[PDB]
Structure formats: structure tokens, C-alpha cells
Design a protein around this ligand. Structure first.
Ligand SMILES: Nc1nc2c(ncn2[C@@H]2O[C@H](COP(=O)(O)OP(=O)(O)OP(=O)(O)O)[C@@H](O)[C@H]2O)c(=O)[nH]1
Ligand SMILES: COc1cc(-c2cccc3nc(-c4cccc5c4ccn5C)[nH]c23)cc(OC)c1OC
Ligand SMILES: Nc1nc2c(ncn2[C@@H]2O[C@H](COP(=O)(O)OP(=O)(O)O)[C@@H](O)[C@H]2O)c(=O)[nH]1
Ligand SMILES: [Ca+2]
Ligand SMILES: [Cl-]
Ligand SMILES: [Mg+2]
Ligand SMILES: [Mg+2]
Lengths: 54, 437, 424, 352
């Protein structure tokens, strides 16, 4: 059980104990996705208002 | 010194953010109006606490925080709160109508109308940073804002701040305190879109925190305030190494270095001990050995799961209070011979230890007693995948009938994003089982 | 936030009046709209249903609609008659003769734009309108025919707001005319298309309750409306009182409605009250509120399965005990809750109890057993329609038989939809 | 009224347990995928332990111990005994055994198996070995018969010392093994069922042709079909304890308790106490119990050897009634009370 890399300060200390050794898409793509979905919404609204107009 | 910006999204992220910043001020001796008398350098500095607070010429110490909710009731209580002076109005951002427990409404519909404003208020904080490490992101899985808007924010932060690290603190949904039947849907959806944008994520199961407050604080029905003061103790344990002198987990990159060897498996289990009622008349203070052993009881974990039936990839012990290395090592030695702790073949069997001599600070009138030593263990074990299995199963039951799906399609989401998200989760569950079995 | 309330026709205005009387008594507001209460809890959410007037007077955000003046003259003369904005009384002189066609196509069409003007004037005065609630019967002409016409127009002008109805179903046991199945079938087709949540209030059930458990031998409409206003108070509790759950119709809809057309809810109330002193225990509230005899829609819950349930407990009690009891009925009768919607039962508590009771519970169930209500209406419809009986009242207003055939088909479809998930 | 679910319909023992529970009038069975159960009688393969104990308002209990497969698969048991200090390489009651994968797939131990195999025809001693996997068995005196055989199939086998000097019952000069049923409850009490069975051979034992494997393998299946004399001496090739006891009294001047049962209890307790820290549910959010079948051999010196542990055993048909009733009493009613014990509790606290 080996204790290594011990560092001490007035606030505390740290160290490491070893028991055993080893055995992003664009802004353009995001704005497009957000507006494809906005288009799908405004389509669905238009189909409703067309249904209410009938 | 390098600054870190904290971002709180939705009800859960904002109310937990409140608890954390309350606790931070108590720990650094910062008063509700922002004055820190012990800060002898007026108007600036580059101390470790300056990672989380900035300074103004009048000596006010201002959190590097952004609060975001799509409805104003929750953040209004921040603006009228005990710590109203602490935060600058530009950092509190509200909409008028919320995401209605709907990931698609928070992501697509309402997200598009507020995202640029939020990235602008974020950039003003970043502009006051000589060196930005990245972000700590607080949110729920289950809310429409917490899930939907967060995933949108995380995508763009990758774009605007590509080399910065991003850490999550994520509230996993539990029926005992739950707000929506569709929380499994939202959880899967936000996990699928956020995965590649998160370097390290600490999951808190509201189930585990609830039962910890019932069993160990003898609170019959815990409130959000009970839950969040315990959560903020854990978060404070995890962040202390960014706010205090030390040599372990000193910047955000070390968290991925020390906790996350595989980037997709970036969900370390947190375990915290001891939790003691303030109404307990007589309490026998627990030793280094007893609290370290307690880090291997499932009843103290932030997510109930059984680490005996998984494998470890990394383990950190963060102690607070009267602890010295000799006693830690005596404690580890004994625990190794009495407990099942197996690492993956390609990792060292070992513990990274951090000690801070100041014991945990308690909130007055809180439910947590003062203790002379506490520990928070961060272990990346494959046993946490049990919570992905629970979530995915609930998702499968509803989605097999397309129950509630129409609410998402109606906001412009395509049904196929459901199955894409669910297949990503299917990959994640098997990644865990490859590593761990 | 703000909800705009509309009450149409005779039944709609009589129940709507009682509702505003009951909940204004709860919130401390007197007939002149002046506050006179104890707690500040009464007014934290007062704005969901009330506008604040000069001198901090509170006036219901309520519009009153009829095609004749009779009922609304009696509302104006009733207990809280002066609490309503006088400009919000919109009425014709013709009446609708219990005729859906007159309410929807001729007499009603003439008056409807006048109603929308008052709705618009109420909407544009709301910081953030969340939606509308309508009280009406389905068996007459104004509430049924014009009421659904208003719902169509309101959706056209506010397609992204929530539409919520309290809908009284006709019953031959409490019947004004033979054409009620016609009017109700025509109305249901509209409701399934254009509302987000409909509380199905069956005059059948209300009579049986008044008869068998309240032991009132000849129930008047007044006795029926006591049950309705008590139930309406209960279902709107979270809309009116401070709680850890917000006054949110949309979040309710999202959690109650897994499929868009299946938004017809079976309400229930406990303890069943008449115009008594013994404390009800939380175990008693819970068992009674789920009792088929406390259901306001004459459907046996054991004949279908619960998709979702919302439960609202009122009064001073152990939420630990409420939680235990709620979890108890679910685990004790897990057969009747669909297993493919996890955790489909949600409970809310509010410390403020209704007048006259120290403890009550209100039940809101989305059961597939509601199909029994629609089959019952369908069989009554078909018994007359197969002989085209009484159709001339409708064809005389421009309607064609085809429109009846379509309305009957769409309601039978709705019945099949419910049957599909009762076996899924 | 308690609730339960059945997820293994191919289970003789829990079929009867399922039926006995409803007869109480205080247990109602739910559909297989209803999650609002108190009790899960689960599947044998990939039982979803991670979904248990997260239903508020329900104490939940399952009829299997997560992790108990380490005992109940031949390769793992070998691995477990050698590697654990509480079993140790120095373990007097397990036949010498070795893990060997086919070369189709390549740790493996066939290197160290050779090392002892050679001191065995060096040293003159009987070098007969068995080979089997978790149907397909081989008993040969020369190793390449063994390793050849396992190359031929695709799964990992174990080579184990074949006990060349077994105890033979007379009349018959015939082999047998002993099966013992063990119930571990949620409290990790270890219960031995008072009744075991001897699975006898119908064939006289023969140490010259290890190829006709019906006097060599005591299995109930291999005996009713491929054997001349199935049922000659004992009904169903099943000798029970009262008879086997009186035989030991008449023929060998001993009892079953002294000569054999103390060893059996010592073995059961040592195995289960070894794995207890790894499988115990004492502070878990759900709870476990499990029925085990331990299989033993007895050599001529009356020394007991453990051959394997079965994690999903069937019972002897005469014994289902009493044993399954026992399971309900101490493993189920233990947790969910309804409105002369057939078990011996295995407990020993020697101080040193
Ligand atoms: N621990 C904890 N969990 C919370 C808190 N607030 C909400 N939650 C959990 O978060 C989930 C609901 O998400 P919210 O954050 O409330 O919803 P939201 O992000 O505001 O999004 P909206 O749908 O627009 O309201 C549920 O699982 C709640 O139990 C909190 O203060 N503390
Ligand atoms: C339950 O009572 C009510 C609840 C709510 C309400 C308000 C905000 C978030 C909510 N999340 C749920 C909820 C969560 C989980 C399951 C649920 C519901 C509802 C039915 N199930 C199966 N409910 C909410 C609003 C109400 O009025 C508008 C109301 O009164 C009927
Ligand atoms: N519960 C209840 N039902 C009513 C009341 N008044 C009328 N009804 C029922 O409503 C239907 C008649 O509709 P009504 O409102 O009188 O006609 P409208 O004026 O054209 O809308 C019949 O089914 C009546 O039984 C009432 O005060 N309470
Ligand atoms: Ca300074
Ligand atoms: Cl960058
Ligand atoms: Mg919110
Ligand atoms: Mg009338």
C-alpha cells in the first residue's frame, strides 16, 4: 500500500494511495434544427386554421 | 487562478443554486450583502475563492452565476431573497410561461426565444474572466426547462466556448417528489442531446436524498429545502477543491482526468457521510474509519445501486475536518479486506485523497448537525447504470403505446428523436456492461 | 396565470353562479366584491379567477351568455349577482328551444361575435392568459350548441391556449326534452376536437347520489348543483390556493392526457355532502373518493382501467397518511391502473378545507370506463335516429341528416378508442 | 393482501410455491410485468435486480441472490475456491480442478494442469480425471484425451480429479451422489433441509472402462434411459436418508450424522459464509432469498467431497410438498406475515 504525491498546505493535504497496479455541431446546424421544428409547428397551425375555415 | 461560471436552469437548478451559494458564502465568510472582511485585497485578487466570486471596487463579492427559468415565480424569490444584494439583476433571467413538463417545449419552442439572451448574459460574465475554465450546470432531468432548455444551452456553449470544460449536476427523477408522468421521456431526451457536450456529470436521485432525510434526519416528509441543503453539502464537497488551496481536483480538467477515463461513461457516483440530525440530543462523533466505511453503504449514495456488482474506474475521497493521511490509510486497509471492491483490469486499484481541515459548515436552523469530520466519495462505477436501466424501462412502457408523444410532436419535435434518444441510451447501457461484467 | 371563465345557457349559468358563490366564499370575497377574510392564503392566487378593481375590489373574470334573458336576470338577482362585471352579461331574446342547431347555426351565430368581444376585452387584460373554462350542459340548445360554437371561435382566435370545460351530460332520469341525446351527440363531437380537458358531469350520477346516499327523495336541480359546485371547488383547488403545485392547466393536461381525444375525465368527491359533524379519517377520504358511488359520471370504474388520476385532499391532515393511503389503493388494486403509464396517480394537498367540512377529497380520473357514458348517449341517439324522429326541428334550421350520421360515427369511434386501451 | 409475480414458469419448486401462496387467501398474483409486487419469483437469466426496491410503499423481495452465480457455475466455483483465502488452494473437500478454455477461444489453466498431471504418471497414482462444463463429459487417464475433447466444443470446461475410490452401496457395488437443499433467507440465516436424497447408480461400478458412463454418472436422466436396472433396488434410483442411515448403521457401524452430515454442514456453511459479504442484502433497498442444491460425493474413507452447487434446483417428487411449504414459512412469511422445523439452522461461533 504505497502513499505517493503527498502535498501539504495550511488548509489541508492531498495524496494518492495505490493498493494494486493495473492488472460538436455548428451554430448553423443548430439554428437550422430549431427552425425546421418551428416550420413543423407553423404547418400544423396552418392545417388547423384551414380546418376551422372549412 | 482560473474562473468558473455556474449556470442554474429551471426550478430545480435555481433552488439548488440558492442552497449552494448560501453555503459558499457561509464557508468563505461572505455576508448576505456581499462584504467579505477577511478579503484584505479590495477590488480584486486571484485567490482560489475568486474562481467562484468576482470583486467590485466597493468590495462586494459577486457570484459568477447565471440563473435561468422560463417562468418568474422561482427566480423572483431569489430577487427578494436573503441574498438579493449578492446577485446582479443581469444574472437573473426569467420568461413568462414555462415549458409545461415538456422537453420539446423547453428545447424547441421556448428555448429558441430566450437562448441568445442567455448566451449574452453568460458572455458578460465570461468577459470579466482573465481565464475561464468552463461551466458548472445545474438542472433537473424531469422538468421541461431543466431538460429541454439545458440541452440547448449545452449545445451552444460547445460552440461559443469549445475548449472549455462543462460539468453537470443533474437531479434524477423520483416519483416520491415528482412533477410529471413524462419525466422518463424528458430524461432520455436531455441525456441523449447533452451526452457529448458534458465532460462530467454528477447525478442526484431525488429518491436517495428523500430517504436519507427520512432515515437519518427523521424528517417524515422532506421538503425541497431539506433536499437542497443536503444536496448543496454534497456539491460543496465536490467543488471545495476549486475554491480552496490544495493540490487535488484543482481545475475542471482534473475532474475528467481523475474521474472519467472513458468520455461517455462520465457519471461518477457520489457517496456522503455522515448525515446527522440537529435534533439528536446525544451523538457519538464518528471516526475516520467509520465514515470511510460508510462510503460503501448504498444507503448513503446519491443513487441507490449496488457497486459490488459492477467495477470501479476511479475513486476519490474528499475529506473535511479532522483527518490525517495515516488514519485514512488505516481505514482503507481495513475496508479492502471486508468489502467487494474490484477495479477494471486497465485501471490501478487506488484512491485519490483530498483533505481540507475545516469541517463542513452547517446552515443555522438547518437539519444537519455539526460534525468534526465528513467525507464525500466520488467513484466512477458501472453500477450507476442501474439507474439508466430503471429510466429506460419506464420509457419503454410508455413509448410502446406512444402515450403522451403527441405533446412533443405538437411542439415541432419529430417522433424519431424519441427512438434515436432511446437507441443512444441502449448503447450507453451496453457500454457500461462491457466495461463492468 | 389568468383563466377566463364562460358560462352558457340555463344549466351553465346556474352552475356557474353557484361556483362563483362557493369559491368567493372560500376566498373571503363578499357579494359586492370586497375582501373580508382572515388569511393571506385566500388572495395569493386570487388573480387566476378575479380581476382587481379600483379600491382593491375583486371581480370574477367571468362572462355570462344566454340566448334568452330569464336565467341571467335571476343570476343578477341572486346572492353574488352584483359581483359580475355588468358589461359581461351577453344575452339574446330569442331562446334556443333546446335546439343544438339554433345554438350553433342560427340564433347563436348572431350573438357569438358579441360574446367574443367581451372575451377579447378580458384576454387583452391578462398579463399571461393560460386559457378558458366553460360551464354548460350538452342537452339543451344554448349551452350545447352555442357553447361549442364559442369553443370553435375561441380556438380560432387563441389556438395556443388551453380550453377546459365542465359539461353536464343529459340523462332520461333528469330530462327536459326528448332531443337531449341529439344535442349531446352533436356536442361531444365538438368537444373531442376542441377541448383539452372535459369534466364529464352526468346528471344520471348526480340524481342517483342525491337519491340513494344523500337520501333526498325528490332531488331538485338545486340539489344537483350543490354536488356540482362542491366538485368544481375541489377540482380547481390548485388553481386558487397556494401550494407546491402551480395553478397550471397545461401541466395538468400534459399529465392527464396520453392521447389527444381521450380527455374526458370522471370526477368524484368525498365526503358526499347535503345542504354533519364527524371527522373523516384520511383512510375514509381515500376509500370514498375512489368509490363508484362518489363518481359524478355514471360509469363503473371496475369496468375499465385508469389511464391517469389526479387526487386533491383538502384540510388539516397527515400527508404521510395521505401518501400511505394513496399508495395503498394503487398497490391494492393495481389491476385497474394501466401498467404502461408508470406512476400515473398524483396527489395534491391544500390546508384550506371547503366550507362546512374539516376534510374533503376530490377525484379526477381518466378512466376508459367513461365509454359507458358515451355508449349510453349513443343508444338513446340511435333509438330515435333510425326512425328520423324529431329531426324536423333540426332540418328546419338548415341541418342535414348527414351531419347527424357523422356525429354518431365520431362518437362511436371515440368509444372504440377507449376500448382499445382497456385491452392494451 | 400481499402481491407477487411469476417470471419462471419452468420452475417445479416455485410453481408449487406460487400455488401454495394463493391458497393462503392473503396473496394475489399479478401479471408478469406488473411492478407493484411484494414478491418476485424471477427468471433464471438476466433477472433485473437493478429495478428492484424503487417502488415507494412496497417492501420487495426476490427469490434469488444477485451474485450467487459465482457459487453455481463450475468454472466460477473453481475460481472462487482457489482465489479466496477462506477457501484457499489448501481446501480439503474440493477435488483438484482447473479452468481450461478451448483453443478456439484461448485466464486459462491448462498449463498448470499438465504440471500436476505429470507427477501423476510419474508418481504411479491414479490419474483419471473428469471434464465438464456449465451432456458432454469425459473421464480419461491421459490428458490429451481431455484437452482434445474440449477443443472440440466451444465453451469453457473444467478438468477435475475423478474420485476413483467412491463409496459403493451393497448389494450392487454401485455409485451415488448426495443432494442437499439449502435455503438462505433475507437475514442470511442458512437453513439445511432435513431431507436429502441419494441419486444412485443402477449399474455396478467399473474402474476399467471409463467410457460406458452409466455406472459412473449418477444423474437421474442418464439412469432411467441408458441403464439396464433403473428402479431395481430403490424407487426412482432415489435412496432417502432414513434408509441410507440404517444401511450405514448395519454395514459400517456408523450414522449418517457423524460420518457424513457434519462434513456436509461444514461445507455448506463455509461456501455461503465466504460469499456473504458480496451478496448479502441486509442493508439493501430490496431483499433476497434463494434455494440451493449442493451435490456431494462420498469416498470409501467416508470423506465428503463437494462436486457442485445448483442455483435453480428441482426437488425430489416426494419432498416438494414439505420443502416448498418450508420456503413459504421461513423465506416469505418471514417478511410478509399472514394473519418442529424441517430445517437445521447452520450456525457455529468457535472462539479463537
Ligand atoms: N432536489 C430537488 N428537485 C427538484 C427541485 N425542484 C424540482 N425538482 C425536481 O425536478 C423535476 C421537475 O423539474 P423542474 O425543475 O421543477 O421543472 P422546470 O425545469 O422548472 O421546467 P418546467 O416544466 O418549465 O417547469 C422533478 O423531478 C422534481 O422532483 C428542487 O428544488 N430540489
Ligand atoms: C393533481 O391536481 C392538480 C395538479 C396540478 C399540477 C400543477 C403543476 C404541475 C403538475 N404536475 C402534475 C402531475 C404529475 C405527475 C402525475 C400527474 C400529475 C397530474 C395528474 N397526474 C396523474 N400535476 C400538476 C394542477 C391542477 O390544477 C391545474 C391540479 O388540480 C386538478
Ligand atoms: N345539473 C343540472 N342540469 C341542468 C340544469 N338546468 C338544466 N339542466 C340539464 O341541461 C339540459 C337542458 O339544457 P339547458 O341548459 O336548460 O338548455 P340551454 O339553456 O339551451 O343551454 C337537460 O339535460 C337538463 O336536465 C341545472 O341547473 N343543473
Ligand atoms: Ca480580494
Ligand atoms: Cl473556447
Ligand atoms: Mg418550471
Ligand atoms: Mg332549460
Amino acid at each position: 500500500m504505497e502513499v505517493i504525491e503527498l502535498n501539504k498546505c495550511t488548509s489541508g493535504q492531498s495524496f494518492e494511495v495505490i493498493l494494486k497496479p493495473p492488472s460538436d455541431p455548428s451554430l448553423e446546424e443548430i439554428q437550422k434544427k430549431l427552425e425546421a421544428a418551428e416550420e413543423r409547428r407553423k404547418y400544423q397551425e396552418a392545417e388547423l386554421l384551414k380546418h376551422l375555415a372549412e | 487562478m482560473r474562473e468558473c461560471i455556474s449556470i442554474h436552469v429551471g426550478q430545480a437548478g435555481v433552488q439548488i443554486g440558492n442552497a449552494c451559494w448560501e453555503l459558499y458564502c457561509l464557508e468563505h465568510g461572505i455576508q448576505p450583502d456581499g462584504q467579505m472582511p477577511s478579503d484584505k485585497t479590495i477590488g480584486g485578487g486571484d485567490d482560489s475563492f475568486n474562481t467562484f466570486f468576482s470583486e467590485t471596487g466597493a468590495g462586494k463579492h459577486v457570484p459568477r452565476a447565471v440563473f435561468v427559468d422560463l417562468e418568474p415565480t422561482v427566480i423572483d424569490e431569489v430577487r427578494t431573497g436573503t441574498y438579493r444584494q449578492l446577485f446582479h439583476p443581469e444574472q437573473l433571467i426569467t420568461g413568462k410561461e414555462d415549458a409545461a413538463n415538456n422537453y420539446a417545449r423547453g428545447h424547441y419552442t421556448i428555448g429558441k426565444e430566450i437562448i441568445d439572451l442567455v448566451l449574452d448574459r453568460i458572455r458578460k460574465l465570461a468577459d470579466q474572466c482573465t481565464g475561464l475554465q468552463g461551466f458548472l450546470v445545474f438542472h433537473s432531468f424531469g422538468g421541461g426547462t431543466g431538460s429541454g432548455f439545458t440541452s440547448l444551452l449545452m449545445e451552444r456553449l460547445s460552440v461559443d466556448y469549445g475548449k472549455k470544460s462543462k460539468l453537470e449536476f443533474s437531479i434524477y427523477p423520483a416519483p416520491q417528489v415528482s412533477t410529471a408522468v413524462v419525466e422518463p421521456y424528458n430524461s432520455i431526451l436531455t441525456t441523449h442531446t447533452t451526452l457529448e457536450h458534458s465532460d462530467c456529470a454528477f447525478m442526484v436521485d431525488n429518491e436517495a436524498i428523500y430517504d436519507i432525510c427520512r432515515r437519518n434526519l427523521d424528517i417524515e416528509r422532506p421538503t425541497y429545502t431539506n433536499l437542497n441543503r443536503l444536496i448543496s453539502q454534497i456539491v460543496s464537497s465536490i467543488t471545495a477543491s476549486l475554491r480552496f488551496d490544495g493540490a487535488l481536483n484543482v481545475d475542471l480538467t482534473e475532474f475528467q482526468t481523475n474521474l472519467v477515463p472513458y468520455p461517455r461513461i462520465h457519471f461518477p457516483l457520489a457517496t456522503y457521510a455522515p448525515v446527522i440530525s440537529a435534533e439528536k440530543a446525544y451523538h457519538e462523533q464518528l471516526s475516520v474509519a467509520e465514515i470511510t466505511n460508510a462510503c460503501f453503504e448504498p444507503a448513503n449514495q446519491m443513487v441507490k445501486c449496488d457497486p459490488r456488482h459492477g467495477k470501479y474506474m476511479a475513486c476519490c475521497l474528499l475529506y473535511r475536518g479532522d483527518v490525517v493521511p495515516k488514519d485514512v490509510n488505516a481505514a482503507i486497509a481495513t475496508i479492502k479486506t471486508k468489502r467487494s471492491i474490484q477495479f477494471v483490469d486497465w485501471c490501478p486499484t487506488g484512491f485519490k485523497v483530498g483533505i481540507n481541515y475545516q469541517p463542513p459548515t452547517v446552515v443555522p436552523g438547518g437539519d444537519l448537525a455539526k460534525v468534526q469530520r465528513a467525507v464525500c466519495m466520488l467513484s466512477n462505477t458501472t453500477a450507476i447504470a442501474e439507474a439508466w436501466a430503471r429510466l429506460d424501462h419506464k420509457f419503454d412502457l410508455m413509448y410502446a403505446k406512444r402515450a403522451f408523444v403527441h405533446w412533443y410532436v405538437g411542439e415541432g419535435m419529430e417522433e424519431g428523436e424519441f427512438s434515436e434518444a432511446r437507441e443512444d441510451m441502449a448503447a450507453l447501457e451496453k457500454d457500461y456492461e462491457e466495461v463492468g461484467v | 396565470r389568468e383563466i377566463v371563465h364562460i358560462q352558457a345557457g340555463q344549466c351553465g349559468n346556474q352552475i356557474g353562479a353557484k361556483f362563483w358563490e362557493v369559491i368567493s366564499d372560500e376566498h373571503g370575497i363578499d357579494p359586492t366584491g370586497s375582501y373580508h377574510g382572515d388569511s393571506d392564503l385566500q388572495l395569493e392566487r386570487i388573480n387566476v379567477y378575479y380581476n382587481e378593481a379600483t379600491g382593491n375590489k375583486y371581480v370574477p373574470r367571468a362572462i355570462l351568455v344566454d340566448l334568452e334573458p330569464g336565467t341571467m336576470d335571476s343570476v343578477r338577482s341572486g346572492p353574488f349577482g352584483q359581483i359580475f362585471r355588468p358589461d359581461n352579461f351577453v344575452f339574446g331574446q330569442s331562446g334556443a328551444g333546446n335546439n343544438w342547431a339554433k345554438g350553433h347555426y342560427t340564433e347563436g351565430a348572431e350573438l357569438v361575435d358579441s360574446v367574443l368581444d367581451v372575451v377579447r376585452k378580458e384576454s387583452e387584460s391578462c398579463d399571461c392568459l393560460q386559457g378558458f373554462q366553460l360551464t354548460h350542459s350538452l342537452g339543451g340548445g344554448t349551452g350545447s350548441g352555442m357553447g361549442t360554437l364559442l369553443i370553435s371561435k375561441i380556438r380560432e382566435e387563441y389556438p395556443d391556449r388551453i380550453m377546459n370545460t365542465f359539461s353536464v351530460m343529459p340523462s332520461p332520469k333528469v330530462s327536459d326534452t326528448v332531443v337531449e341525446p341529439y344535442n349531446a351527440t352533436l356536442s361531444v363531437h365538438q368537444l373531442v376536437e376542441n377541448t383539452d380537458e372535459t369534466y364529464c358531469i352526468d346528471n344520471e350520477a348526480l340524481y342517483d347520489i342525491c337519491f340513494r346516499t344523500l337520501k333526498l327523495t325528490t332531488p331538485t336541480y338545486g340539489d344537483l348543483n350543490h354536488l356540482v359546485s362542491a366538485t368544481m371547488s375541489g377540482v380547481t383547488t390548485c388553481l386558487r390556493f397556494p401550494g407546491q403545485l402551480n395553478a397550471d392547466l397545461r401541466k395538468l393536461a400534459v399529465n392527464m392526457v396520453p392521447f389527444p381525444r381521450l380527455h374526458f375525465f370522471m370526477p368524484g368527491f368525498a365526503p358526499l355532502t347535503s345542504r354533519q359533524y364527524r371527522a373523516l379519517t384520511v383512510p375514509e377520504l381515500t376509500q370514498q373518493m375512489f368509490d363508484s358511488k362518489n363518481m359524478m359520471a355514471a360509469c363503473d370504474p371496475r369496468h375499465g382501467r385508469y389511464l391517469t388520476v389526479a387526487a386533491i385532499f383538502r384540510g388539516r391532515m397527515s400527508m404521510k397518511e395521505v401518501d400511505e393511503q394513496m399508495l395503498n389503493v394503487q398497490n391494492k388494486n393495481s389491476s385497474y391502473f394501466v401498467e404502461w403509464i408508470p406512476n400515473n396517480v398524483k396527489t395534491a394537498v391544500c390546508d384550506i378545507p371547503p366550507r362546512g367540512l374539516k376534510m374533503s377529497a376530490t377525484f379526477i380520473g381518466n378512466s376508459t370506463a367513461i365509454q359507458e357514458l358515451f355508449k349510453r348517449i349513443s343508444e338513446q341517439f340511435t333509438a330515435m335516429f333510425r326512425r328520423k324522429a324529431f329531426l324536423h326541428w333540426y332540418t328546419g334550421e338548415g341541418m342535414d341528416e348527414m351531419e347527424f350520421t357523422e356525429a354518431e360515427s365520431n362518437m362511436n369511434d371515440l368509444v372504440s378508442e377507449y376500448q382499445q386501451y382497456q385491452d392494451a | 393482501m400481499y402481491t407477487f409475480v411469476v417470471r419462471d414458469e419452468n420452475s417445479s419448486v416455485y410453481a408449487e410455491v406460487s400455488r401454495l401462496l394463493l391458497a393462503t387467501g392473503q396473496w394475489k398474483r399479478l401479471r408478469k410485468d406488473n411492478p407493484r409486487f411484494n414478491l418476485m419469483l424471477g427468471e433464471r437469466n438476466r433477472l433485473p435486480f437493478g429495478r428492484l426496491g424503487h417502488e415507494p410503499g412496497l417492501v420487495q423481495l426476490v427469490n434469488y441472490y444477485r451474485g450467487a452465480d459465482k457459487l453455481c457455475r463450475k468454472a466460477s466455483l473453481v475460481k472462487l475456491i482457489k482465489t479466496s483465502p477462506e477457501l484457499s488452494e489448501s481446501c480439503t473437500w474440493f477435488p483438484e480442478s482447473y479452468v481450461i478454455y478451448p483453443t478456439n477461444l484461448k485466464t486459462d489453466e491448462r498449463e498448470v494442469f499438465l504440471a500436476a498431471y505429470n507427477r501423476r504418471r510419474e508418481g504411479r497414482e491414479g490419474n483419471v480425471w473428469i471434464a465438464k462444463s456449465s451432456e458432454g463429459i469425459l473421464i480419461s487417464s491421459e490428458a490429451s484425451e481431455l484437452l482434445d475433447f474440449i477443443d472440440e466444443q466451444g465453451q469453457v470446461h473444467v478438468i477435475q480429479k475423478y474420485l476413483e475410490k467412491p463409496l459403493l452401496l451393497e448389494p450392487g457395488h454401485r455409485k451415488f451422489d448426495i443432494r442437499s437443499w439449502v435455503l438462505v433467507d433475507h437475514l442470511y440465516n442458512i437453513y439445511l433441509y432435513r431431507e436429502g436424497v441419494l441419486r444412485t447408480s443402477s449399474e455396478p461400478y467399473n474402474s476399467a472402462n471409463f467410457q460406458d458412463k452409466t455406472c459412473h454418472l449418477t444423474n437421474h436422466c442418464i439412469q432411467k434411459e441408458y441403464s439396464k436396472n433403473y428402479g431395481r433396488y430403490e424407487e426412482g434410483n432415489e435412496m432417502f436418508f432414513e434408509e441410507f442411515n440404517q444401511y450405514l448403521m448395519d454395514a459400517l457401524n456408523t450414522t449418517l450424522e457423524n460420518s457424513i452430515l457434519l462434513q456436509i454442514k461444514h461445507i455448506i456453511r463455509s461456501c455461503l459464509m465466504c460469499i456473504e459479504p458480496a451478496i448479502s442484502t441486509k442493508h439493501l433497498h430490496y431483499q433476497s432469498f434463494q434455494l440451493f442444491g449442493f451435490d456431494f460425493m462420498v469416498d470409501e474413507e467416508l470423506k465428503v467431497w463437494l462436486i457442485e452447487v445448483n442455483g435453480a434446483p428441482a426437488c425430489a417428487q416426494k419432498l416438494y410438498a414439505e420443502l416448498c411449504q418450508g420456503i413459504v414459512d421461513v423465506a416469505i412469511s418471514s417478511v410478509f406475515p399472514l394473519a418442529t422445523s424441517i430445517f437445521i439452522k447452520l450456525h457455529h461461533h468457535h472462539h479463537h
